[PDB]
Amino acid sequence: GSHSMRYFSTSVSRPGSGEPRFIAVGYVDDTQFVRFDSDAASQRMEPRAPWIEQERPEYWDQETRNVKAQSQTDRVDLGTLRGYYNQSEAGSHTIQIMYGCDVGSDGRFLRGYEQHAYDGKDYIALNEDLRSWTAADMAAQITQRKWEAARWAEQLRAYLEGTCVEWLRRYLENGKETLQRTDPPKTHMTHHPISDHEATLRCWALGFYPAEITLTWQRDGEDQTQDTELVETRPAGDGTFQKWAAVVVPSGEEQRYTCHVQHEGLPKPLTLRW
Amino acid sequence: IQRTPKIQVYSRHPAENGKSNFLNCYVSGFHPSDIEVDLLKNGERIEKVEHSDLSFSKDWSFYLLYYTEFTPTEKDEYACRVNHVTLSQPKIVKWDRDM
Amino acid sequence: AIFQSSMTK
Numbered sequence: 001g002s003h004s005m006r007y008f009s010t011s012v013s014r015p016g017s018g019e020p021r022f023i024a025v026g027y028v029d030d031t032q033f034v035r036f037d038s039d040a041a042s043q044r045m046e047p048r049a050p051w052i053e054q055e056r057p058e059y060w061d062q063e064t065r066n067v068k069a070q071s072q073t074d075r076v077d078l079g080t081l082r083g084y085y086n087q088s089e090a091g092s093h094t095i096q097i098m099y100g101c102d103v104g105s106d107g108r109f110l111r112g113y114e115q116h117a118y119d120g121k122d123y124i125a126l127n128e129d130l131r132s133w134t135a136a137d138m139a140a141q142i143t144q145r146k147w148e149a150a151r152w153a154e155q156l157r158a159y160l161e162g163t164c165v166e167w168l169r170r171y172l173e174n175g176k177e178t179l180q181r182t183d184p185p186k187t188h189m190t191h192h193p194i195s196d197h198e199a200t201l202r203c204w205a206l207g208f209y210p211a212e213i214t215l216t217w218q219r220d221g222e223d224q225t226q227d228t229e230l231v232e233t234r235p236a237g238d239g240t241f242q243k244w245a246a247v248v249v250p251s252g253e254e255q256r257y258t259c260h261v262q263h264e265g266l267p268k269p270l271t272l273r274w
Numbered sequence: 275i276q277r278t279p280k281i282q283v284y285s286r287h288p289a290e291n292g293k294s295n296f297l298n299c300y301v302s303g304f305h306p307s308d309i310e311v312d313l314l315k316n317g318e319r320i321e322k323v324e325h326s327d328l329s330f331s332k333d334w335s336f337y338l339l340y341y342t343e344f345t346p347t348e349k350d351e352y353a354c355r356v357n358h359v360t361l362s363q364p365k366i367v368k369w370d371r372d373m
Numbered sequence: 374a375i376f377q378s379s380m381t382k
Contacts, residue, residue: 026375063375067375069379073379077381099376143382150380159378
């Protein structure tokens with residue numbers, strides 16, 4: 001199948017309490033594999049998946065140097081943005097960045113992306129062409145004009161089409177048993193009365209990977225979102241995910257309702273009925 | 275702009291009295307990232323609790339999984355206590371085994 | 374592997 005590598009970072013200023021807190025994590029699809037935390041004692045990039053541990057000490061030296069270098073950029077940018085927005089020195093602010101690349105089944109580059117946020121709102125994003133930017137407001141337009149003039153997108157594009165893809169290809173093989181798997185949802189329905197006249201049907205999906213799933217309720221084969229409810233997909237803690245969807249129904253009409261489950265690991269979508 | 279946490283409290287495997295399991299508190303949808311999350315057993319904070327590394331979703335809100343190994347019983351009650359700037363007092367969410 | 378370069382805003 002197709003796959004992604006993504007790096008996420010969060011820098012939080014702490015005025016009058018030292019350097020910003022910087023935390024970075026790397027993922028291949030929905031599997032985390034590295035972390036760095038500027039408050040931790042090691043001051044190293046650290047493994048967070050079994051299949052990255054085999055990388056040799058040169059790898060960890062490289063990842064540590066490069067994640068620390070990004071943390072220095074972000075610390076200076078916290079000051080710059082405080083200035084762009086004419087904000088006080090007293091307040092804590094956050095810069096978040098996510099970038100990544102996607103490959104197909106044969107490892108060919110599909111697409112790259114990079115997005116930046118300030119205080120949890122869009123700040124600047126690389127466009128899908130990997131050649132130009134979209135700024136969210138007048139401050140980010142300063143950054144846009146600067147990065148355009150410096151041809152910065154060219155360096156990012158070279159990473160996203162090049163290094164990014166090569167390393168993702170490698171991780172997919174070294175971590176094949178974990179990363180090239182699809183675990184289909186184990187599904188079941190529960191049924192309980194709410195009262196004399198209504199019952200709850202709950203449709204469960206357990207133990208699935210990757211996290212992407214769709215749970216749909218239908219009524220006489222026609223889509224139904226009136227009187228339904230679904231929880232956010234959640235991690236089980238062991239590398240699989242859980243989700244459920246429920247519907248409140250008139251007692252005696254359970255037969256009309258169907259739960260439909262779509263997941264990459266199912267040859268065919270499932271239909272569950274009570 | 276601050277976003278209040280969503281909270282789910284649940285077990286890794288279906289709960290079986292006297293069978294070891296993992297108690298999860300999944301906190302998501304929140305901003306800023308500074309947060310305190312504790313797992314409680316009959317109202318008392320469980321000492322040994324671990325959590326995932328800070329990450330965030332497409333809408334920039336943060337999420338964390340807090341978890342501990344536990345062996346459920348019929349009488350023991352579990353909860354998750356979330357302390358965040360958006361909450362005027364900490365929010366305590368009970369573990370419902372059916373949920 | 375993380376991107377080895379970054380540019381200030």
